[PDB]
């Protein structure tokens, strides 16, 4: 297991524009196109992202290209974030994957509501961290996925991803 395989499990792979769990137009491996309810705006974003007229459809290679960009951008974002970087840098590699996964899903803004969880993670109070993480819209809206990511934070193993 690694961050790619982990996020591939969590996000799936769809080659046509679809709506994510929040109802937002998305494609590939959880590549968010737009929060606009306007399908044409999503199609425009898609074309801009791929560099061709896609007509709402991409190939596996294109999906994986966006995915690489998105994962890298998530990591680079964490590193530029004065609140996230020290916590991220305190973690071992497996727990860092949980961190990237969470940021990938909810964005840096999405995190940030997680001040108390971040402090517990930096403290390596893993069970307490895991309890705090589950007290969230995140967990309640996507529990099966959040459970996996939380188990990864709690254990620093890939047990939840088999």
Q: Where are the alpha helices (DSSP H) in the chain?
A: 3-11, 39-50, 60-80, 85-90, 93-110, 115-122, 126-134, 137-141, 143-155
Q: What distance in Å separates the CA atoms of residue 41 and residue 37, rounded to the nearest whole number?
A: 8
Pick one of 111, 130, 146, 160: the residue that binds ligand CCOc1ccccc1O (CB under 6 A): 111
Q: Does 97 bind ligand CCOc1ccccc1O (CB under 6 A)?
A: no
Our finding on whether 118 is near ligand CCOc1ccccc1O (CB under 6 A) is yes
β-pairing verdict for 14-19 and 31-34: unpaired
Stretch that binds ligand CCOc1ccccc1O, among 1-9, 21-29, 114-122, 140-148 (CB under 6 A): 114-122
Footprint of ligand CCOc1ccccc1O (CB under 6 A): 78, 84, 87-88, 99, 102-103, 111, 114, 117-118, 121
């Amino acid at each position: 297991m690694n961050i790619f395989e982990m996020l591939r499990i969590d996000e799936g792979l769809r080659l046509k524009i679809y709506k994510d769990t929040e109802g937002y137009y998305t494609i590939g491996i959880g590549h968010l196109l737009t929060k606009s309810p306007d399908l044409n705006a999503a199609k425009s974003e898609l074309d801009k992202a791929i560099g061709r007229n896609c007509n709402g459809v991409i190939t596996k290679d294109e999906a994986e290209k966006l995915f690489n960009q998105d994962v890298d951008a998530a990591v680079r974002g964490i590193l530029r974030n004065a609140k996230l970087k020290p916590v991220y840098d305190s973690l071992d590699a497996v727990r860092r994957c949980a961190a990237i996964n969470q940021v990938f899903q909810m964005g840096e803004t999405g995190v940030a509501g997680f001040t108390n969880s971040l402090r517990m993670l930096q403290q390596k109070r893993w069970d307490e961290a895991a309890v705090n993480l589950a007290k969230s819209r995140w967990y309640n809206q996507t529990p099966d996925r959040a459970k996996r990511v939380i188990t990864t934070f709690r254990t620093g193993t890939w047990d939840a991803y088999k």
